[PDB]
Amino acid sequence: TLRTYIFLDALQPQLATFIGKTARGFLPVPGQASLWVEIAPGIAINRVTDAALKATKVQPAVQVVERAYGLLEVHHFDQGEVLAAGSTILDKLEVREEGRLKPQVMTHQIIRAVEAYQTQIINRNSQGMMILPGESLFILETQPAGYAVLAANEAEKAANVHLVNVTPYGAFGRLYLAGSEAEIDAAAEAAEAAIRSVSGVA
Amino acid sequence: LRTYIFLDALQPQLATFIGKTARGFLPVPGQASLWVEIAPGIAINRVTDAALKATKVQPAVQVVERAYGLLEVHHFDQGEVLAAGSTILDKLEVREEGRLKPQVMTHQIIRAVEAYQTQIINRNSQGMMILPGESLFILETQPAGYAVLAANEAEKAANVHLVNVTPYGAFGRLYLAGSEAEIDAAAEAAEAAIRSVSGVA
Amino acid sequence: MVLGKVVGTVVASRKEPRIEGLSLLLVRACDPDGTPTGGAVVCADAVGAGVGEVVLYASGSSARQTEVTNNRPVDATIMAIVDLVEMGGDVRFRK
Amino acid sequence: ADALGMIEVRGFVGMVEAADAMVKAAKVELIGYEKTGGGYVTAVVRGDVAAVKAATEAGQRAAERVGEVVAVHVIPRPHVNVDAALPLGRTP
Amino acid sequence: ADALGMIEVRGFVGMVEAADAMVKAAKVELIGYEKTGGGYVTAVVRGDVAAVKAATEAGQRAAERVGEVVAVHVIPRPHVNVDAALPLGRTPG
Amino acid sequence: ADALGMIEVRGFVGMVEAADAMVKAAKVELIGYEKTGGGYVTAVVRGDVAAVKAATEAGQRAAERVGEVVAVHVIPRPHVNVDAALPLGRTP
Amino acid sequence: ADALGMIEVRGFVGMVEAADAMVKAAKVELIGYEKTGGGYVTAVVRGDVAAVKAATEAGQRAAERVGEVVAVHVIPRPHVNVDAALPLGRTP
Amino acid sequence: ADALGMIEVRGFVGMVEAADAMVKAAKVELIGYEKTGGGYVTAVVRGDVAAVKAATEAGQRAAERVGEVVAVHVIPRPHVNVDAALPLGRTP
Amino acid sequence: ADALGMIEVRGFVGMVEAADAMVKAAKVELIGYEKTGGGYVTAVVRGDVAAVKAATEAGQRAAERVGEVVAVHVIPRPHVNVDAALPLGRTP
């Protein structure tokens, strides 16, 4: 069951830095073309990964077996390789582009002037760049979990913010973003427009 | 006593790593801090409680593994943190000028860090990410107690993001990472702060 | 020393042997407006003046007060090129 | 009344560097600066006694390396007439 | 904020040559000058730490040809209260 | 815009002598004098480049016979930011 | 606009090593190279104000071993006319 | 038919530094550069004569820091045959 | 892409002996040579790094006994801008 199929054309450097910090695999560099596939049950993702690797020369970084879900990231500099890998993944599961679930935003907030007594908690809860006291905060939760990196990537392509945390595997893909008010506002508008512009099965 | 530094006002990013690292009270940015590494490291457990009871301070950091035991105490009023520093330096009955003077060992800036170095540097998780294509200043202060002070003096000097500042060890390695001009402006202040302390050689 | 336009060039062949290698120029004296009207004196170039430039030249014993024209029979030499002529608040001539 | 700290330097660059070190070093209030003529400019911060005594030490140590520190001094409790007469920021 | 660069010259003329060399040397902003008496005049520029550093170096090497420099110093990240309290061109209001 | 001639003299009679010679020497607008305090007074004159370059040299010759000259300089093309935030006559 | 950096080496090999270390040492575009004859070849890079400075300071180190470095110089902000009249990348 | 400044440097880098200094000094027009082989490059400048004079005096001082300056010379007004028979940017 | 071996010889005979020994000594592609004028010519070969290194360290031996080898250098991976801006082969 295909839950998430999202194609990232170019990785912005904080997302690629965060994946290179917190993945189990071959770490991606900025500028590469990436693909995120989340299916259920979370052990057929090894078969999906085997099909994508035996077809093309794409390279995996994130291959995570969750409680019920399964995530695969592949990436290469040439987008033809990643698109052919995605075509092989859709042919192995015998599903289409729009067989994926339509992503739902279940919590979006812009918290402004975050106190120090919250930023210390957020700092000892994450892995990305440290939120600083006084900076704005954009939190975001998307269902399914695999679309959150999309909500990460477009929020850096159209703004100049810092990535605090992104968890793309689980029951809710979570995204934290720190920065000034105009930059968090631009990143929030861009990410909320990026999630809602994805077709699929509701 | 190997080191006794008083970070008078913590900058807005050194206290974030002090909150992401410390075992104790989490420091808020930026109250104050007193860092004292005093050998041997079994008297630090008895010097920390006296300073925690005598003042209104809150202890943040803890001992080093099989070495001198460092202690960073963080109070809001700088008078209270200075009183806790005098209490911890009178529990050991050593002088405040008897600290070992900080010696810079290896300062090195590495501009345009590639993405491989970004991965191998970001994998050791302390602070702000390496951001492939940047600079990186990596200094080492001897003893390791002074190095966190350098992390303040590179945050009040330029807009550099802090990668890691290991105050707990034999020598304190501090790597910061920003743009190519801010990293030079920050490394100059880190060296000029760590080479300006007074004490025994 | 009077200002005039450099009208022409004079090429002497049989000359006094000290002043060989020295350029000669017909300078006719002009008004401070900048139009030449007067007698044309064959004076020696010491600055690099060409045809049509407005120059100063100085005649007399103070025509020899240059390294170029030190002890030479030089009656008048060109010492400066006019860039501007201020005449009581109206710049009459520019370069 | 808050404690009083002052650094007088011959020069304006030394005064701005001293004021930066005093503000970045502790939680004091940079009020302004008194131009007593002759190139001398004095930077006046006011705040709590430990804060001012740390800000003053850092401003002295930072302004010695760009300039010409004349006098550096901290009053822990100024008299009420000192604040009422002299332009030290807290004029009621 | 914007980086801060100052050149103090004991003389107005060396100050003007310093300020002209700074604004031609990089992309900075001459925001003004400070007369502190006794012949001491300080030219103040704001900009970016690369630009202010590269500008203030050429301002120093051009202000030594004319007058005498007393102090040359670059402050890469001045505090908010210092921009609010001293006449440094980024005052809010 | 217009080129900038400056002559700074520690005296005041030297500045009036220099400003008078710079006005008499060429078609240059005397555009003011700047009192930086402590004796030091700068005559600021401003015109075309040939005019300022002749005038400022003549004013340098004239000011050195009357007082002690401090600095003589000519900027042939002042930057727009210079004329903006300085009292040099051609500020808009 | 963008800052300019130049390495002049008397050989082609030193110019290639200088150009390589300039590009590898900072996010700095390599425009190309100008031959002047006589051996002398200049590599021309262009980018940020300090990135070009670190690029030249690391290209000079590299070209001093495999060649003879004549001239290393950075221009932090060249004029409109210089880019418009020289082969330096940003010709409109 | 304006004046003519030429700064000849045996390096390309000293030529571009002299070029930038001549343009930033006064309001002059930089046509370009002449490569006479052997290393020798020449920067060529057009403007009114005092502007070119001050431009070349600034460009020589900036080019002696970098390279070997061969010749600096200013022609106040070149002949018509000189402009028509040599590549000096005023060819009709 | 492929590596970059090049040696520079002041003279054409030494460079041709260099190019011959490099393409006989390992598996490299002689893409050509470059004239920087004044007697210098530079032979350039491309291949994988061990072949490029073994080719240059034999071409230097064979061209050292002929002419004037100025400089020998091997680049294991040139940056994509150096290949994209310089006549080294592999230009996209």
Side-chain angles (χ1 to χ4, degrees), chain A, chain B residues 9 12 15 19 22 24 27 29-30 32 39-41 43 50-51 54 59-60 67 69 79 83-85 98 102 112 115 127 132-133 143-145 147 150-151 154 157-158 167 169-170 172 177-178 181 185-187 189-190 192-193 199 201, chain C, chain D, chain E, chain F, chain G, chain H, chain I:
Chain A
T1 301
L2 181 63
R3 293 180 63 86
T4 300
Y5 178 79
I6 187 61
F7 174 74
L8 295 175
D9 54 355
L11 294 176
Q12 296 296 319
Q14 291 175 357
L15 179 61
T17 305
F18 189 83
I19 298 163
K21 189 169 184 177
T22 59
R24 304 286 183 87
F26 296 94
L27 306 171
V29 309
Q32 285 173 348
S34 179
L35 178 67
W36 294 89
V37 177
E38 183 179 2
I39 63 170
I43 206 164
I45 199 65
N46 294 115
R47 188 178 66 245
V48 170
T49 307
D50 182 74
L53 290 174
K54 292 290 179 67
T56 62
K57 290 181 181 179
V58 299
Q59 193 172 6
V62 178
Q63 197 278 127
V64 173
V65 176
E66 205 262 332
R67 184 176 180 86
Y69 297 156
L71 187 62
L72 173 61
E73 192 273 337
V74 292
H75 54 270
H76 192 74
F77 290 97
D78 185 74
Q79 293 187 357
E81 291 290 326
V82 182
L83 289 174
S87 297
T88 304
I89 286 171
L90 293 177
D91 289 331
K92 177 61 70 177
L93 296 174
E94 291 183 354
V95 297
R96 292 179 65 190
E97 185 73 28
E98 291 85 4
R100 60 186 177 180
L101 273 74
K102 188 176 186 294
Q104 296 178 358
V105 173
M106 294 181 72
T107 297
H108 64 88
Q109 289 292 110
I110 298 169
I111 302 168
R112 291 178 289 174
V114 182
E115 293 290 327
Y117 290 164
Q118 186 177 2
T119 60
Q120 300 301 110
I121 294 171
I122 296 169
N123 286 323
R124 197 182 287 174
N125 203 2
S126 70
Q127 279 74 237
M129 292 183 181
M130 295 184 291
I131 188 166
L132 297 177
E135 291 177 352
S136 297
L137 179 63
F138 174 70
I139 59 172
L140 183 58
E141 292 183 357
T142 59
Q143 183 179 3
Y147 291 104
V149 289
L150 176 67
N153 196 2
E154 295 291 326
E156 188 178 355
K157 189 185 289 184
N160 193 358
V161 298
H162 288 170
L163 183 62
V164 175
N165 193 3
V166 55
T167 302
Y169 59 95
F172 300 102
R174 289 179 176 90
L175 179 65
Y176 293 166
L177 292 169
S180 64
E181 291 85 3
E183 294 170 349
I184 288 298
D185 196 1
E189 181 69 29
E192 290 176 355
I195 294 298
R196 73 186 69 188
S197 65
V198 173
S199 66
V201 176
Chain C
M1 57 189 75
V2 291
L3 72 161
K5 286 178 94 287
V6 179
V7 169
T9 63
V10 174
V11 182
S13 63
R14 172 65 172 270
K15 61 175 72 175
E16 196 271 331
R18 297 178 185 176
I19 66 170
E20 65 182 359
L22 181 58
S23 177
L24 299 171
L25 298 172
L26 283 171
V27 168
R28 183 184 297 273
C30 69
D31 57 353
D33 196 0
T35 64
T37 299
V41 57
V42 186
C43 62
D45 190 1
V47 179
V51 174
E53 299 181 357
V54 175
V55 302
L56 277 84
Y57 69 96
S59 64
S61 176
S62 63
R64 299 193 299 272
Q65 303 297 318
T66 312
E67 291 183 354
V68 180
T69 63
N70 194 4
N71 285 316
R72 282 85 187 274
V74 173
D75 195 7
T77 187
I78 295 171
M79 53 163 60
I81 298 171
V82 169
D83 296 337
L84 298 178
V85 176
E86 176 186 0
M87 289 290 290
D90 290 332
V91 177
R92 300 289 184 183
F93 175 74
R94 293 184 62 87
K95 184 73 171 178
Chain D
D2 292 332
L4 174 64
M6 292 174 288
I7 293 171
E8 179 173 0
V9 289
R10 179 178 286 271
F12 179 75
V13 179
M15 191 274 294
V16 175
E17 179 64 29
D20 275 324
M22 289 189 287
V23 172
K24 292 177 185 179
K27 193 174 181 180
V28 301
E29 181 179 359
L30 182 66
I31 295 168
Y33 66 106
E34 180 68 28
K35 294 191 286 185
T36 62
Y40 293 150
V41 174
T42 303
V44 178
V45 299
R46 287 183 69 91
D48 291 333
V49 181
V52 168
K53 196 177 288 185
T56 284
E57 287 181 353
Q60 181 182 2
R61 183 171 57 245
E64 281 174 353
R65 293 184 290 112
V66 299
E68 197 174 358
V69 284
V70 175
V72 170
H73 187 68
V74 172
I75 293 96
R77 187 175 182 177
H79 195 273
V80 182
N81 198 6
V82 177
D83 289 330
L86 294 177
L88 296 175
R90 310 294 173 86
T91 302
Chain E
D2 287 328
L4 172 63
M6 291 178 180
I7 292 171
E8 179 175 358
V9 180
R10 190 176 177 179
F12 189 78
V13 178
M15 187 277 295
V16 175
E17 177 60 32
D20 187 73
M22 285 188 282
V23 301
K24 290 177 180 176
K27 186 173 72 175
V28 296
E29 177 181 358
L30 182 68
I31 60 174
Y33 74 108
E34 182 69 28
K35 290 186 290 185
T36 59
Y40 293 94
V41 181
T42 301
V44 179
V45 294
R46 299 296 294 267
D48 301 330
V49 54
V52 170
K53 190 65 63 66
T56 311
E57 290 177 355
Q60 185 177 3
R61 79 176 67 254
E64 289 178 352
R65 292 184 61 200
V66 178
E68 61 178 2
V69 292
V70 176
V72 167
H73 184 69
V74 176
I75 299 165
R77 190 184 181 181
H79 202 269
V80 181
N81 297 318
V82 172
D83 293 333
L86 299 179
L88 267 55
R90 296 290 185 269
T91 302
Chain F
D2 294 332
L4 171 64
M6 292 176 289
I7 290 174
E8 179 179 3
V9 179
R10 176 60 181 265
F12 177 72
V13 179
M15 189 276 295
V16 183
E17 182 69 34
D20 180 72
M22 289 190 290
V23 170
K24 288 178 179 175
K27 181 66 176 65
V28 192
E29 177 179 0
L30 183 63
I31 214 158
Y33 72 106
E34 184 67 29
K35 288 167 66 178
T36 65
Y40 291 95
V41 179
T42 298
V44 177
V45 89
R46 197 169 181 95
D48 285 329
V49 182
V52 166
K53 186 66 69 176
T56 305
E57 292 177 353
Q60 182 183 4
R61 298 292 187 273
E64 291 178 354
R65 288 177 288 172
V66 57
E68 61 270 15
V69 71
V70 177
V72 171
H73 196 69
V74 174
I75 293 97
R77 185 183 60 82
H79 194 270
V80 180
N81 206 164
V82 168
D83 293 329
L86 286 180
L88 266 53
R90 292 283 185 267
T91 175
Chain G
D2 289 331
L4 180 70
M6 288 173 287
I7 308 298
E8 185 170 2
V9 191
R10 196 178 176 179
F12 182 76
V13 176
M15 188 276 295
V16 173
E17 176 63 28
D20 196 11
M22 285 191 285
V23 183
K24 286 184 179 295
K27 187 176 181 179
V28 164
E29 186 181 4
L30 173 60
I31 294 163
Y33 73 108
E34 181 69 27
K35 294 179 180 177
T36 67
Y40 298 93
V41 179
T42 300
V44 171
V45 299
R46 181 173 280 267
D48 280 331
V49 182
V52 167
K53 190 181 288 183
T56 59
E57 288 178 353
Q60 183 179 3
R61 291 183 181 180
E64 281 173 352
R65 295 180 181 178
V66 293
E68 178 179 359
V69 181
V70 175
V72 174
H73 190 75
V74 182
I75 296 169
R77 190 183 179 184
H79 200 267
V80 178
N81 196 3
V82 178
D83 287 328
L86 294 175
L88 298 179
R90 301 296 185 270
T91 299
Chain H
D2 284 329
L4 179 66
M6 293 182 183
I7 293 177
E8 189 176 6
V9 180
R10 197 185 170 183
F12 180 77
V13 182
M15 189 277 294
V16 181
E17 177 60 32
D20 182 73
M22 286 187 287
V23 175
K24 286 180 179 177
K27 187 185 72 176
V28 298
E29 181 186 3
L30 192 139
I31 308 158
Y33 70 107
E34 188 71 31
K35 291 189 287 183
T36 59
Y40 294 95
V41 194
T42 305
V44 180
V45 155
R46 308 286 291 174
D48 47 350
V49 54
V52 170
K53 184 75 171 65
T56 55
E57 288 178 353
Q60 183 182 4
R61 286 194 294 269
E64 286 186 352
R65 291 179 60 196
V66 178
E68 294 176 352
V69 171
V70 175
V72 176
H73 188 71
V74 175
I75 292 171
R77 184 170 181 176
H79 198 272
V80 182
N81 206 167
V82 176
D83 289 332
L86 289 175
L88 298 177
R90 292 288 184 267
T91 62
Chain I
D2 291 330
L4 179 61
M6 53 174 67
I7 86 161
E8 179 181 1
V9 178
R10 189 176 185 180
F12 188 72
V13 180
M15 187 271 290
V16 169
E17 184 67 32
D20 182 70
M22 285 187 286
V23 300
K24 287 184 180 294
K27 186 176 180 180
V28 296
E29 181 185 4
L30 184 71
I31 59 98
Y33 69 104
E34 190 69 28
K35 298 178 186 294
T36 64
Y40 293 157
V41 282
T42 303
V44 176
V45 293
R46 309 299 296 266
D48 50 351
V49 183
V52 170
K53 192 181 291 292
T56 56
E57 73 189 6
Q60 185 181 2
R61 288 187 287 112
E64 185 176 359
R65 63 186 66 189
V66 178
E68 182 176 359
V69 177
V70 176
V72 177
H73 185 72
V74 178
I75 292 174
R77 178 179 60 86
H79 195 277
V80 66
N81 208 167
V82 178
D83 291 331
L86 273 70
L88 295 176
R90 272 71 174 170
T91 64

